Subunit: 273 residues, 5 copies
């Protein structure tokens, strides 16, 4: 059976198949994912007036990201259940090509919304000092797009061409390091001339950002993090990848948005928190 | 046939199958469930302005839980009708593995929204005295997460390994007892320095909370509450489990939210009821 | 063919099948049903501020019922088209058990929202005199639940056990008569000490309530209202039942809600009719 | 192949089948239809505050009609693609009875919302001089209902019984002429005592109303407007019917609603166009 | 096999089929498309109050376009995955006629919303000088309709009749040039009597408009832009066409709407950027 430039989920599914626990867990974690995003959409809309007018764009951009993430995770939850079907003889779920092959690439192109908007929205809460707004925005958006597109190309080859997978991944990582660099400056400048309570929130935002964003390259490498024929090149690695994505999605989008909202409240003249 | 680590609904469905009443009732009760949650979402949004600004976060968190519960019960309603198909020869509904096995685990991971948010929202209505907000929140969220995850692992073994089922269930129960303990403190402190009308509502909330939350471990054990080859290890137990879930869902999420809203009104300077 | 405890729609569908007109009409009338409810949801939300704050809960409860009725009629519309499939050889639609048997019981459990909320909402518009709010509410909700649950059990036996059908129906009818009794008291007390305009609307509400609610037991009996092998034990009775449900649904939920809104306007100090 | 009392789309589909252009166009025009209605729903809600309070009910009733038309055209768009399936051997789309026969009757029962509400809403913008509001409303609603129900019965016989088709159509046309008569009076009285700009809009509304509403009986007769075995008794007539419906739907519901909104603005003390 | 007047996607799909990358990418880019539009819908609604009342109609018309584009791209995303199915033997996705042939014509008829509304909305932000509002609107709408309808007819013949394809395309292009001419006048008059900041935004809008709108005829010609049996008459051309549509959709609808919003803010007495 030729699968070509397909994600490793399809190779595990076509050879060993998935146990009840592996198949059900992956469905459950994607379902939790899209439920969090629709709940988050409601939260960010309903709390718009908790902050001064100038900060409300951050709530709006959080809502924009919630719409993207809800739609994508809802679609992927259906893609999972469509791509793997129970075999009564062996009692496992095997690749069902009539559902299409499963592909994580759905996430990557939707990041062309998420990444630009997540990076942009902090610039509506913090005030820059030494950095120029337009310059930070342009660097975030350029490096964001390049990081996503190079990684997108890479993940198609995660089984078919390990070399292409690692080279494209390495190129993507360079743009990622640039984003980390710029965001660190933005957090530092944001701390300047605000209450200590605001400064503490920005310290928390930086840690959240660094960990949550690093989880995505972690999900990229997941199948090979225990090397060739390792523990993770298995249904266990399939489960781990979607779990890491869901932790990263909730952390990078919802918790990030909530912390920015809390910062906006502290910076708001009327509001106290 | 080989079903592995699957819920007992699939064993009943694959051996005896379900009568018209058992199959239809389970579909009906899940449909009522998701209808209550979407109706509740509308209620919590439309009543936001019935309470002082400081209490409105409770309405918002109720709405967040309604989104989670609606999405999950809607999905599970479809999962039920997909997993069991009419056999014309015998006139009963039998396991249809092309629909996937039925799994209650969908509920468990979505509780990672419901439980944390339900426990959190009371802290936006009552005032603590001796207990610290952040400390109560952290205990609720840590013990809530551990209770859910341990029970989640357990329910996969409810047929395949009764020992694992009972041990994981027992560990989960310990975290549950801790939650009951902390919530009792919160209700007691909440009663201090408020009107007798408010105190009565908090007394009602405690009883509602204790009964509604205890129904979940009840649903966990349901198939075995009449022992080996008991009355409940049957389509009658399948019906009973989803009925208990729906009573618990409506009670723990909607009625809880309504009572908290009514408490917020009594604590609101402008508002009266 | 063995259908067990199934609604008579399935017996007609499995024996005679449905003509184009019978099949299409039943689909059309259910589609009109769910369209009216979603349109009504929009109407009740958009007119909230047309009445004094104290009356707005009636708009909210109308909206809650609209959500329930929309969801249920939308689901039942799909259930109808799934349960009956065209046979090319004879040119009629026959029972397709792969879609599941058709069951009116979906409506019954959703009445656990509709009935309690419809009975409750009038208590936010009229003022009681001799009766206590909590007492009327409790009687409405207790007798409402018992009426629904006993009728729900009954309708499963409408073909398989005419005796059980009529006995459960009779028990349900007793609870219905109690509801009619309590609602008559509520209307009488509501008329006391209000404008003639208000009194006229309450007279209209009583007639609407009495006729619209009585249509439901009419739908229950429909197949047998022309006796054994009568005109209505046919596709014509199948059509008649869903037509009566749709007239009852629109009358009891939407028109009732509109009249209560109009009553609220007349009782509103700020608002004018 | 026995189709019985079915619309002519099914006879063309079962005999000649549909070319790529005929099948795709019909799908496209229904898709445009439902898109216009959901976009219109948003427009009528967002512009509510552009007119004086007394005129806002017209926006609300426009929104109500948008909900009905969106739901119906969305359902019919799916019904079209379900009822006709590609035959690879000849490269045409043929009747697929597993999808159900296609029926325009879906539209007719939903007109029980559209027609009453479209006729009603003008009475919240114009002021009558000779005519009583309640009397005009009752005439519109009675004649609207009778026009719809008689036409609904007729269209089932458009192939099976040309005589029934034409007689029911003729009876329906009588009620239609009554509606045209009453609406002409309403427009004339509406022009009395308003600005010339308002009078011009009402002149436009009358022309729009007369043409857009006459398109519906045009769609009814479409297959036979070129006589027996004429050009229109073909895939070309199938296309023409749905095109005429979509022009009529957009004109009678959206453009009508926009012109009424524009009239309301001119009659509004605060507002100007 | 015989495909008749069908888009070239179906010819590639039926002969060579699509690689994993070609099939998945096309699905991903359409998914991004509809996600951007629903996120944009939320953005345009939530930012309505960021501009003076007189400019808010531009936000409303942006929202209207978002509804159209979301619905269309969502439907087309499903049409793509329905029209091509994995062949296990060769590991490619081939035409699945049971899903219907794929057709870009869905986009064209929905442009009867998008094009008229996009051209109209600028007239609620800029002030004309020498040109009449009604005259510019009428020219936009007439030439817009003719451009769309002629191109719509053309694209059905892109394989079956290259001559019809190029002639209808040429006629469509003439109406397009007229639109470019009128929009240039509108931009010029719009620049008169506004701040240099406003003039810069209008310069950007003109460039965006010219490039984004020209991408549509580019997508029309895509398969033949490398001549007969060129590189683009392939899965690579299929990918390129949907990529160009998505870039054009985001640019012409969302970015255009955002720039108009930014212009409205600069022209707003209360607000500043
Ligand atoms: C598994 C992870 C579950 C994520 C939890 C909720 C998701 C829904 C989003 C709602 C976020 C609510 C956060 C909150 O309640 O914060 C209030 C804030 O402190 C006062 O402004
Ligand atoms: C997140 C992604 C981070 C990428 C990690 C390392 C990139 C190292 C640079 C690329 C070096 C190529 C190594 C290689 O090609 O080894 C494959 C081997 O031949 C088996 O077939
Ligand atoms: C079987 C389950 C049935 C559940 C029905 C679904 C309920 C949804 C929310 C309805 C909430 C009920 C309304 C209560 C409002 C209330 O508590 O009283 C008003 C308050 O005092 C301010 O005036
Ligand atoms: C095996 C049997 C398991 C028994 C576990 C029982 C209870 C767990 C209680 C743990 C709760 C402590 C969590 C940490 C915490 O929340 O600390 C408080 C907060 O940090 C202060 O600010
Ligand atoms: C937080 C605490 C985490 C620790 C959990 C250990 C408890 C896990 C209990 C596993 C039970 C295994 C078992 O019962 O095995 C049965 C055997 O295979 C034949 O019956
Ligand atoms: C809610 C959850 C509360 C359940 C707590 C009940 C008992 C916990 C004690 C651990 C039980 C371990 C005994 C294992 C056992 O009973 O095995 C029977 C049989 O041999 C295997 O099929
Ligand atoms: C055994 C087979 C025969 C069965 C035939 C049944 C006949 C039922 C007739 C009337 C229902 C009256 C029920 C009483 C309603 C109780 C209301 C209630 O529970 O609320 C009390 C309220 O609080 C006050 O203070
Ligand atoms: C709405 C439902 C109203 C039902 C009215 C029937 C009255 C009494 C039924 C008593 C049971 C009689 C059963 C004997 C007939 C039979 O079983 O044959
Ligand atoms: C058979 C041909 C009948 C065609 C008659 C056309 C006029 C219809 C009704 C007028 C009734 C006036 C208003 C009715 C209010 C009740
Ligand atoms: C109830 C409505 C009654 C409608 C029944 C009349 C149908 C009709 O006109 O009959 C057609 C003809 O008998 C067959 O071709
Ligand atoms: C005012 C409402 C009119 C009510 C009933 C009129 C019934 C008359 C319409 C029935 C016509 C049926 C018909 O034309 O039958 C022709 C026959 O089938 C060819 O052979
Ligand atoms: C809108 C409803 C139109 C109703 C009646 C118009 C028909 C009146 C004209 C008389 C019909 C007789 C007829 O056309 O006969 C058919 C003949 O078989 C073909 O050659
Ligand atoms: C076959 C090759 C195609 C040739 C390419 C044609 C391009 C120009 C088309 C039309 C120009 C004028 C059309 C204007 C249509 C009416 C709108 C209008 O100008 O009227 C406004 C009214 O006067 C209120 O002020
Ligand atoms: C009016 C434009 C009509 C153009 C039709 C056309 O170009 O047809 C070409 C012909 O089919 C080439 O064989
Ligand atoms: C802005 C986003 C766009 C990104 C999407 C990329 C898709 C590339 C599309 C077109 C390039 C091809 C231009 C064609 C120029 C070559 C002409 C040619 O090859 O000659 C024709 C042939 O030789 C005579 O028979
Ligand atoms: C919610 C969406 C977010 C925050 C997306 C973030 C995505 C990344 C940080 C992706 C990074 C990658 C690498 C650093 C290397 C491998 C390829 C990527 C794109 C997964
Ligand atoms: C609406 C969601 C709610 C209130 C969820 C509550 C869940 C529980 C209280 C679960 C408790 C469990 C045990 C104590 C033992 C067995 C495993 C669990 C997780 C079902
Ligand atoms: C919109 C929902 C409403 C108003 C539901 C009303 C339901 C009833 C009045 C049901 C009555 C019944 C009987 C009195 C006898 C037979 C069984 C029932 C439940 C259909
Ligand atoms: C959007 C809904 C509208 C405006 C509905 C209008 C429907 C009609 C004017 C129908 C008229 C008919 C006749 C006059 C004869 C044939 C049967 C009808 C019902 C199509
Ligand atoms: C978002 C929708 C937009 C902006 C649509 C624009 C459509 C066009 C500019 C279409 C132009 C065409 C030609 C100039 C020639 C070929 C046929 C068309 C219709 C694609
Ligand atoms: C799944 C493996 C990746 C986890 C990365 C943890 C974050 C560390 C960066 C500081
Ligand atoms: C002025 C009143 C007449 C309006 C015109 C309506 C035309 C209806 C005919 C339907 C179109 C047939 C196309 C073949
Ligand atoms: C930085 C992390 C990258 C480490 C690369 C590890 C090389 C993995 O090696 C690969 O493992 C697969 C599954 O085990 C095998 O099927 C492949 O044949 C093999 O190339
Ligand atoms: C704390 C409540 C747990 C009670 C444990 C009951 C033990 C049931 O025992 C189990 O019952 C099943 C169904 O009858 C049988 O199929 C199994 O063989 C048997 O092990
Ligand atoms: C309306 C309340 C009383 C109704 C009782 C009517 C008795 C119905 O009688 C039933 O009729 C069915 C269809 O005709 C038959 O198939 C059954 O054999 C017969 O028991
Ligand atoms: C007012 C318009 C009514 C005209 C009705 C006359 C047309 C009836 O002609 C019908 O045409 C069908 C297809 O062309 C044939 O299949 C039928 O046999 C024939 O009766
Ligand atoms: C202005 C751009 C239009 C250029 C028209 C080029 C003519 C293309 O020629 C066509 O190429 C197809 C694909 O290779 C072939 O299948 C056709 O047989 C051939 O007619
Ligand atoms: Na599956
Ligand atoms: Na598929
Ligand atoms: Na089923
Ligand atoms: Na499946
Ligand atoms: Na069907
Ligand atoms: Na089924
Ligand atoms: Na089709
Ligand atoms: Na079907
Ligand atoms: Na596919
Ligand atoms: Na199909």
């Amino acid at each position: 059976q030729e699968l070509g430039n397909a994600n490793f989920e399809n190779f595990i599914g076509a050879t060993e198949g998935f146990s009840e626990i592996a198949y059900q867990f992956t469905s459950h974690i994607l379902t939790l994912g899209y439920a969090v995003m629709l709940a988050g959409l409601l939260y960010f809309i309903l709390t718009i007036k908790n902050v001064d007018k100038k900060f409300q764009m951050s709530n709006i951009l959080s809502a924009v990201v919630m719409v993207s993430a809800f739609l994508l995770l809802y679609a992927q939850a259906q893609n999972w259940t469509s791509s793997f079907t129970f075999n009564e003889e062996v009692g496992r779920y095997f690749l069902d090509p009539s559902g299409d092959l499963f592909n994580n690439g759905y996430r990557y192109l939707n990041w062309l919304i998420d990444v630009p908007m997540l990076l942009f929205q902090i610039l509506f809460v913090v005030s820059l000092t030494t950095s120029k707004f337009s310059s930070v925005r342009n660097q975030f958006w350029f490096s964001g797009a390049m990081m996503i597109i190079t990684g997108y190309i890479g993940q198609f080859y995660e089984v078919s061409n390990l070399t292409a997978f690692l080279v494209w991944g390495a190129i993507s990582s360079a743009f990622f390091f640039h984003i980390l660099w710029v965001m660190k400056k933005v957090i530092n400048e944001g701390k300047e001339g605000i209450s200590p309570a605001g400064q503490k929130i920005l310290s928390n935002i930086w840690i959240l950002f660094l960990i949550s964003w690093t989880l995505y390259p972690g999900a990229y490498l997941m199948p090979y993090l225990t090397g060739v024929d390792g523990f993770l090149y298995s249904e266990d690695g399939v489960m781990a990848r979607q779990l890491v994505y869901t932790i990263a999605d909730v952390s990078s989008k919802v918790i990030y948005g909530v912390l920015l909202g809390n910062l906006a409240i502290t910076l708001s003249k009327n509001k106290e928190l």
